[PDB]
């Protein structure tokens, strides 16, 4: 404990496997240090090539383990540092070690690959090209997952989620297809961490174009996502909500699967969740669902979710309120006249008008857009007057006319539009 770099270098350069082993172990402990671990000094000393060569000493499993751990400590730092480990030839060496008869050594290799793949798209794809996926999946090829050591199972799930991570580009379609069945199995495993990381992996794969959303949804995971959406553990709910949120940016049939799985019955509690980001992401998800078909809007109505949207619009973090505004504009643009009537009876007008005094230019356009849609529904019933009166009684015109002095063009036109058509002669 507490060796200098000079001494580690000296032991590692000796012609003595045991001396090298003690020095490597000393290096790992130094790199394990919590405050200010001298990763850059270790790299500057030229130790990484030597650590990588110790990975192949199949005759001396303890120096395999120490250098794996030392190297993983470097690889779990910055991108330059991870680059240094990769530049040392570590990826093939680590993939070879997945096959090691020592679980401790196999596990380090899993964690190493996880940190390398997790650093970015190019390294993720490099790990895949070196053929990491097959021996990783082979480590989970048992009849029942419960028979694997918990920490072992957690490390493998974490590493697979990293192979699913990042965009531009997203992972190769072939690799996603190869990984997905094991992922679906992990998503049914009873361990909070395995579930959380499985959820993350799904949320990564669903974060893109509808074809990738489809690859996931064809595998029947949506009912399991909805169940996880109801969990007590925030670290499961958070990625499950993200995945559900991604899926409803897809086609109407993809969205409908989310509704069919019973997802909307969880949203009264999500739209009032004490954690700001859950509530934000729930309202975003709602805005994509109110942008769907009229029968899908009708299910939002039937689950009693409209009062909850009115509530979030009335009081919430501003970014959440911005999402609720979108949910409303999407609802009003695609909704039937009866569905828009119902929205106004729930009390949408007053908190809609109040958000017109926000100095965020975009929410103003969104709200004015929704007001226009509601008037068009009112035009079909001849309640245009009652609507104008109602808007005027909560202070709507004060906010709408003051928006004519607004130094943004798109706002002013649509602002003046309204004052003219529904508040004149
Ligand atoms: C014309 N499409 C409108 C639409 C559909 C679906 C979602 C959103 C959205 C835009 C910005 C923030 N949140 C949600 C907007």
Q: Whose CA is nearest to atom 6 of ligand 1?
A: 288
- The string of DSSP letters for 146-209 reads GGS-HHHHHHHHHHHHHHT---SSPPPHHHHHHHHHHHHHHTTSS-HHHHHHHHHHHHHHHSS-
Return the sign of the alpha-carbon dihedral for residues 193, 196, 200, 201. Answer: positive
Q: Torsion angle of alpha carbons 336, 342, 346, 349, nearest 10°?
A: 60
Residue 54 CB coordination number (10 Å): 23
- Cα(285) to centroid(ligand 1), Å: 10
373 touches ligand 1 (CB under 6 Å): no
Give the length of the chain: 425
The token pair at 268 is 């009264």
Token pair, residue 255, equals: 């969205």
Going by the DSSP 8-state scheme, the letter that residue 88 receives in this structure is T
Experimental method: X-ray
> Could you please report the per-residue DSSP string of 12-38?
HTSS-HHHHHHHHHHHHHHHH-SSS--
Residue with tokens 């000094």: 41
Closest Cα to residue 271, out of 284, 289, 261?
Answer: 284
Q: What residues make up the domain containing 144?
A: 1-425
Which residue's CA is the nearest one to ligand 1's atom 7?
288
Q: How far is the CA of 203 from the centre of ligand 1 (A)?
A: 19
| Angle at the Cα of 418 from the Cα atoms of 416 and 419, rounded to 5 degrees | 65
**Ligand 1 atom at minimum distance from 323 CA:** 13
- Helix axes of 61-75 and 17-32: crossing angle, nearest 10 degrees: 30
**Can you say how many angstroms the Cα of residue 222 is from the centroid of all Cα atoms in its chain?**
16
Cβ-based neighbour number of residue 408 at 10 Å: 13
- Find the 287 Cα to ligand 1 centroid distance in Å: 7
Q: How far apart are CA 251 and CA 178, in angstroms?
A: 24
Rounded to whole angstroms, how far apart are CA atoms 114 and 23? 26
Whose C-alpha lies nearest to ligand 1, atom 10? 326
Residue 230 φ then ψ, to 5°:
-90, 0
Helices 294-302 and 252-260, packing angle to 10 deg: 20
CB 186 within 8 A of CB 157: yes
Two tokens, residue 11 = 């032991």
Resolution (angstroms) stands at 2.4
What the block records as the tokens of 257 is 């699967």
The best mutation among 250, 288, 321, 322 to test binding of ligand 1, ranked by most ligand atoms within 8 Å of the C-beta, falls on 288
Question: Among candidates 12, 8, 13, 14, which has minimal Cα distance to 38?
Answer: 8
How far does residue 166's CA lie from ligand 1's centre (Å)?
A: 23
For residue 316, the domain's CATH number is 1.25.10.10
Q: Helices marked H in 234-290 — which ranges?
A: 234-247, 252-260, 267-270, 276-289
Q: 217 alpha carbon to ligand 1 midpoint, in Å?
A: 22
CA–CA dist 78, 54 (Å, integer):
23
Q: 152, exposed or middle or buried, with CB in 10 Å at 0-12, 13-18, 19+?
A: middle
Q: Give the CA dihedral 352, 354, 355, 357, nearest 10 degrees.
A: 140
Which DSSP string corresponds to 107-144?
HHHHHHHHHHHHT-HHHHHHHHHTT-HHHHHHTT-SS-
Contacts of 228 (CB under 8 A, 6+ apart): 187, 195, 199, 236, 237, 240
Of the CA atoms within 13 Å of residue 284, those in its CB half-sphere come to: 17
In 3D, which of 389, 379, 377, 383 has the Cα closest to residue 353? Answer: 389
Is the shortest distance between the CB of 330 and ligand 1 below 6 Å? Answer: yes
Q: Rounded to the nearest 5°, which phi and psi values hold at 380?
A: -70, -10
With tokens 């770099």, the residue in question is 5
Q: Is the CB of 284 under 6 A from ligand 1?
A: yes
Counted domains in the chain? 1
- Output the residue whose Cα is nearest ligand 1's atom 9: 326
Distance in angstroms (rounded) separating the CA atoms of residues 221 and 44: 47
């Amino acid at each position: 404990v507490n060796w200098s770099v000079e001494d580690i270098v000296k032991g590692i350069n000796s012609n003595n496997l045991e001396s090298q082993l003690q020095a490597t172990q000393a290096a790992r402990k130094l790199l394990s240090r919590e405050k200010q671990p001298p990763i850059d000094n270790i790299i500057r000393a030229g130790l990484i090539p030597k650590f990588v060569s110790f990975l192949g000493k199949t005759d001396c499993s303890p120096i395999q383990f120490e250098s794996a751990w030392a190297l993983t400590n470097i690889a779990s730092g910055t991108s330059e540092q991870t680059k240094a480990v990769v530049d040392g030839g570590a990826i093939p060496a680590f993939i070879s070690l997945l096959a090691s008869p020592h679980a401790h050594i196999s596990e380090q290799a899993v964690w190493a690959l996880g940190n390398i793949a997790g650093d970015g798209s190019a390294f993720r794809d490099l790990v895949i090209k070196h053929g990491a996926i097959d021996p990783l999946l082979a480590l989970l090829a048992v009849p029942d997952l419960s028979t694997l050591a918990c920490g072992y199972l957690r490390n493998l799930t974490w590493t697979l989620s990293n192979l699913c991570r990042n965009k531009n580009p997203a992972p190769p379609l072939d690799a996603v297809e190869q990984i997905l069945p094991t992922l679906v199995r992990l998503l049914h495993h009873n361990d909070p961490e395995v579930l959380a990381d499985s959820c993350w992996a799904i949320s990564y794969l669903t974060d893109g174009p509808n074809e990738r959303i489809e690859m996931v949804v064809k595998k029947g995971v949506v009912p399991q996502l909805v169940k996880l959406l109801g969990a007590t553990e925030l670290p499961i709910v958070t990625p499950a909500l993200r995945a559900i949120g991604n899926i409803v940016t897809g086609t109407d049939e993809q969205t409908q699967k989310v509704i069919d799985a019973g997802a909307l019955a969880v949203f009264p509690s999500l739209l009032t969740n004490p954690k700001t980001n859950i509530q934000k992401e729930a309202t975003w998800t709602m805005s994509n669902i109110t942008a769907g078909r009229q029968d899908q809007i009708q299910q939002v109505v039937n689950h009693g979710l409209v009062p909850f949207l009115v509530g979030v619009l009335s009081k919430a973090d501003f970014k959440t309120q911005k999402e609720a505004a979108w949910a409303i504009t999407n609802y009003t643009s695609g909704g039937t006249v009866e569905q828009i009537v119902y929205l106004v009876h729930c009390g949408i007008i007053e908190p809609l008008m109040n958000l017109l005094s926000a100095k965020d230019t975009k929410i103003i356009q969104v709200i004015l857009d929704a007001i226009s849609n509601i008037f068009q529904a009112a035009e079909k019933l001849g309640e245009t007057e009652k609507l104008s009166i109602m808007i005027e009684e909560c202070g709507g015109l004060d906010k709408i006319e003051a928006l004519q002095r607004h130094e943004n063009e798109s706002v002013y036109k649509a602002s003046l539009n309204l004052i003219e058509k529904y508040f004149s002669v």
